[PDB]
């Protein structure tokens, strides 16, 4: 079986710049290689076929090169909307095989998070669990420190973070940190605080609430 290998798990670029993604077949495949673009939460979309041909509707800034074993997708004039995973695929023979994908990431200027905290809803407590949600909205770069304080005690181990992919329009991240407590533990303390440290903030910002108010 002929394999195709993408050695770059990530490639980073800025708006208006170019990025190249490599793909190596394990044996000669001629020009029978295709490229696909998969934006977050979407199915793959076809970009390149026969190594270098663009479908109708694909901008000329997308190019592909190579013959034999070494193939390259190049995106010129990169747009924020190009944030996606890019896959190569050979079809010189069955079985048809895919590369592992390369994520193209967008560098941009610093953007501080907007921070919000959400107490557990009365609905949720009725079932013995308490989720407290801290939201960090539309920030860049990805590095961000989130600290949970319950009556000034630092929490560690009882919260989980999830992050979106870079936004197709402004290239920012958003992040949720969810503190999960037993209702019994939640009712034992008053002040719930989410503290956020980030390059775009002059100093850490804290959002907080008093349970019961």
């Amino acid at each position: 079986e002929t394999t195709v290998t993408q050695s770059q798990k990530f490639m980073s670029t800025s708006v208006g710049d170019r990025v190249s993604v490599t793909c190596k077949a394990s044996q000669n495949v001629g020009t029978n290689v295709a490229w696909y673009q998969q934006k977050p939460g979407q199915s793959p979309k076809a970009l390149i076929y026969s190594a270098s041909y663009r479908y109708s509707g694909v901008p000329d800034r997308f190019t592909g090169s190579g013959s034999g074993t070494d193939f390259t997708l190049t995106i010129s004039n990169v747009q924020s909307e190009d944030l996606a995973e890019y896959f190569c695929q050979q079809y010189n023979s069955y079985p048809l095989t895919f590369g592992q994908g390369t994520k193209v990431e967008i560098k941009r200027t610093v953007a501080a998070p907007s921070v919000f905290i959400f107490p557990p809803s009365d609905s949720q407590l009725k079932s013995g669990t308490a989720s407290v949600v801290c939201l960090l909205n539309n920030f860049y770069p990805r590095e961000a420190k989130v600290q949970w304080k319950v009556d000034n005690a630092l929490q560690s181990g009882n919260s989980q973070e999830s992050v979106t992919e870079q936004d197709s329009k402004d290239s920012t991240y958003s992040l949720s940190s969810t503190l999960t407590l037993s209702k019994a533990d939640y009712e034992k303390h008053k002040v719930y605080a989410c503290e956020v440290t980030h390059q775009g903030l002059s100093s850490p910002v804290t959002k907080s609430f008093n349970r019961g108010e």
Partner: protein
């Protein structure tokens, strides 16, 4: 104008069977080969079947041979994938695709989860909002199995500023996620905000109005 729309994904016990369907439109279906490609949780893509335009030739990888059967009904403009002797490694999102060598159109995908666990629908709780200007609100979608859930706002009409986070697997074996949106704070008392949660494997739909 080419569209491919899959259906049939479900939770199925290990060793069981499931048939996926793909409805084509916007092209002459009988003039193209058709294929199935799946994407595993690690996001790798695996081609799993190809059928010629007339249905006479079929091709499979060794991982699925004799367990998966691709077929088509050209009169109906439909493609099928019959899956049997299902294995844990078959869990994936399955894509209908046009052509038999490279794939110039892909469907939206339908998900198979191979599992002996029971399905459980989500519980949905408001993330209540409220200087000013911008308010944040959302829904916590908790304790469901398996993935995925789909979340929209106001039945798909509110999309600007929506962030639906990736699900996280809890120790209970159930998934949880939140979906949030930022809105003008001046509208909270007049504009209605409803998160629509669809969990197909449990046939559960939940709409929660999120109020100040």
């Amino acid at each position: 104008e080419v569209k491919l729309e899959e259906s049939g994904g479900d939770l199925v016990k290990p060793g069981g069977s499931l048939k996926l369907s793909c409805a084509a439109s916007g092209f002459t279906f009988s003039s193209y080969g058709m294929s199935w490609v799946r994407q595993t949780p690690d996001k790798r893509l695996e081609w799993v079947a190809t059928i010629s335009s007339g249905g006479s030739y079929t091709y499979y990888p060794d991982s699925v041979k004799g367990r998966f059967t691709i077929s088509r009904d050209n009169a109906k403009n439909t493609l099928y994938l019959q899956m049997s002797s299902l294995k844990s490694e078959d869990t994936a999102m399955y894509y209908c695709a046009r052509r038999g060598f490279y794939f110039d159109y892909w469907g939206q995908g339908t998900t198979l989860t191979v599992s002996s666990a029971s399905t459980k629908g989500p519980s949905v709780f408001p993330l209540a909002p409220s200087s000013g200007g911008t308010a944040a609100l959302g829904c916590l979608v908790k304790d469901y199995f398996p993935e995925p859930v789909t979340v929209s706002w106001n039945s798909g009409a509110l999309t600007s500023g929506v962030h639906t986070f990736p699900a996280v697997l809890q120790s209970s074996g159930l998934y949880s996620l939140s979906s949030v949106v930022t809105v003008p704070s001046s509208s909270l008392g007049t504009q209605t905000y409803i998160c629509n949660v669809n969990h197909k494997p449990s046939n559960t739909k939940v709409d929660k109005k999120v109020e100040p």
